[PDB]
């Protein structure tokens, strides 16, 4: 029927003045574009078919050709930037926004999908979709008393497209667009579908990846407890964006960070800092490093929750990039912590895994670790216990590492190494 | 996991 | 507000 048409035949049918001939040719184009291996997107673009597809979007009296061209344009728009641009250049954005109000659910869903692809290209096309007025019709489709009455696949497509309207950072989405979208996002964050939840958290993670004012717009909508709950989900596609969102929020103020602590997030971190997926461990340790960069009462909550032994853990054994986040977590801890808090670090065994990491060739992690050691020695000076710590560093081979680092190509590796030796290893 | 664009095979 | 905070690397 419409399987395995040549492009030349598709053009012949679309160029006839017979709507039914154009419908069959358009469906055949859709089927070509739907195959997984190397769909002839450029061949379809080169044949001048995009203006015709866009024109078919407006044929209200023939909804099948609206659907077939919507699907075809969706798949062209799903390619490279140049391929998405060709769809935009053909006038597709307002035609797709007009289809959002279609009485045919499968047609409006396809328009939702298509706009998601166009917005997904980047901030310029994202903001152009916003300027054409897409947000109001999109949100109207979710203005129902109970989300559960909407078709699952429909709801997932709306959520995903909304997440693209929140994505990308230079520039971030318009402030008023984010405010318009947020209450619907909050509602989707409480839905029970795992895919809606994953994409909802992805959207929140994009919105919190910016300055503190962007974080605050999200935080004051009250989503932090729900994010913490999703942090404990069994589905890793939910935990990853939830954790990215939580970690983003703790890059903000101590007040915004405190709301993460208040919501009970630290109790999840024994699992996160031992999580088998290496990227979860990295994100969780980075998150921890920004919490230990906070106030002393926030460092105390890390201590209370038993998380210092888990930092000793990842410092002792983890992927290197996670180990460097753990080094940062320690140095931040030692910069803001009390004497008692810093002494507790030593009691948990931080010193030897810290010393072993001075074997690394990463120059910045060596600077990080030497800053931590200096801060710990400063805590030892206020107690008259500098030498008990020097023998501890010497007994685990740490002194041999600090002494060797005086011959390092960076000129503050040495200049911190020799000062440590000059002052504490006389 | 979070692709910017999605192709429709259906 | 807090200069000790680090963005993602």
UniProtKB/Swiss-Prot annotation, chain A:
ARM repeat locations: 1-40, 41-80, 81-122, 129-173, 175-211, 212-251, 254-293, 296-338, 339-385, 386-425
Tissue: Slightly detected in brain but not in cerebellum and skeletal muscle, highly expressed in testis and spleen.
Compartments where found: Cytoplasm; Nucleus
GTP-binding as UniProt keyword: no
Residue ranges of coiled coil: none
Any Gene Ontology CC annotation: cytosol
Post-translational modification: Ubiquitinated. Deubiquitinated by USP22; leading to stabilization and increased activity.
Chain segments carrying region NLS binding site (minor): 244-332
Keywords: Acetylation, Cytoplasm, Nucleus, Phosphoprotein, Protein transport, Repeat, Transport, Ubl conjugation
Residue segments, region NLS binding site (major): 71-167
Molecular function (Gene Ontology), one example: DNA-binding transcription factor binding
GO BP term (any one): postsynapse to nucleus signaling pathway
Family per similarity comment: Belongs to the importin alpha family.
Domain comment quoted from the record: Consists of an N-terminal hydrophilic region, a hydrophobic central region composed of 10 repeats, and a short hydrophilic C-terminus. The N-terminal hydrophilic region contains the importin beta binding domain (IBB domain), which is sufficient for binding importin beta and essential for nuclear protein import.
Subunit annotation: Heterodimer; with KPNB1. Component of a complex containing CSE1L, RAN and KPNA2. Interacts directly with CSE1L. Interacts with PLAG1. Interacts with APEX1 (via N-terminus). Interacts with FRG1 (via N-terminus). Interacts with ARL4A, CTNNBL1 and NBN. Interacts with ANP32E. Interacts with SNAI1 (via zinc fingers). Interacts with SNAI2 (via zinc fingers). Interacts with BAG6. Interacts with AIFM2; this interaction likely mediates the translocation of AIFM2 into the nucleus upon oxidative stress. Interacts with RSL1D1.
Record function comment: Functions in nuclear protein import as an adapter protein for nuclear receptor KPNB1. Binds specifically and directly to substrates containing either a simple or bipartite NLS motif. Docking of the importin/substrate complex to the nuclear pore complex (NPC) is mediated by KPNB1 through binding to nucleoporin FxFG repeats and the complex is subsequently translocated through the pore by an energy requiring, Ran-dependent mechanism.
Name of the featured protein: Importin subunit alpha-1
From Swiss-Prot, chain C:
Consequence when changing residue 6 to I: In CRC; uncertain significance
Post-translational modification summary for this protein: Acetylated. Deacetylated by HDAC6 which prevents the MutL alpha complex, formed by the MLH1-PMS2 heterodimer, from being recruited to the MutS alpha complex, formed by the MSH2-MSH6 heterodimer, leading to tolerance of DNA damage. Ubiquitinated by UBR4; leading to proteasomal degradation. This ubiquitination is counteracted by the deubiquitinase USP5.
Result after altering residue 8 to W: Risk factor for LYNCH2; no effect on MLH1 splicing
Membrane-crossing residue ranges in chain numbering: none
Tissue-level expression: Colon, lymphocytes, breast, lung, spleen, testis, prostate, thyroid, gall bladder and heart.
Residue numbers covered by motif Nuclear localization signal: 5-8
Subcellular location: Nucleus; Chromosome
Assembly mode: Component of the DNA mismatch repair (MMR) complex composed at least of MSH2, MSH3, MSH6, PMS1 and MLH1. Heterodimer of MLH1 and PMS2 (MutL alpha), MLH1 and PMS1 (MutL beta) or MLH1 and MLH3 (MutL gamma). Forms a ternary complex with MutS alpha (MSH2-MSH6) or MutS beta (MSH2-MSH3). Part of the BRCA1-associated genome surveillance complex (BASC), which contains BRCA1, MSH2, MSH6, MLH1, ATM, BLM, PMS2 and the RAD50-MRE11-NBS1 protein complex. This association could be a dynamic process changing throughout the cell cycle and within subnuclear domains.
Function: Heterodimerizes with PMS2 to form MutL alpha, a component of the post-replicative DNA mismatch repair system (MMR). DNA repair is initiated by MutS alpha (MSH2-MSH6) or MutS beta (MSH2-MSH3) binding to a dsDNA mismatch, then MutL alpha is recruited to the heteroduplex. Assembly of the MutL-MutS-heteroduplex ternary complex in presence of RFC and PCNA is sufficient to activate endonuclease activity of PMS2. It introduces single-strand breaks near the mismatch and thus generates new entry points for the exonuclease EXO1 to degrade the strand containing the mismatch.
UniProt similarity note: Belongs to the DNA mismatch repair MutL/HexB family.
Protein name as it appears in the record: DNA mismatch repair protein Mlh1
Provenance organism: Homo sapiens (Human)
Gene that encodes it: MLH1
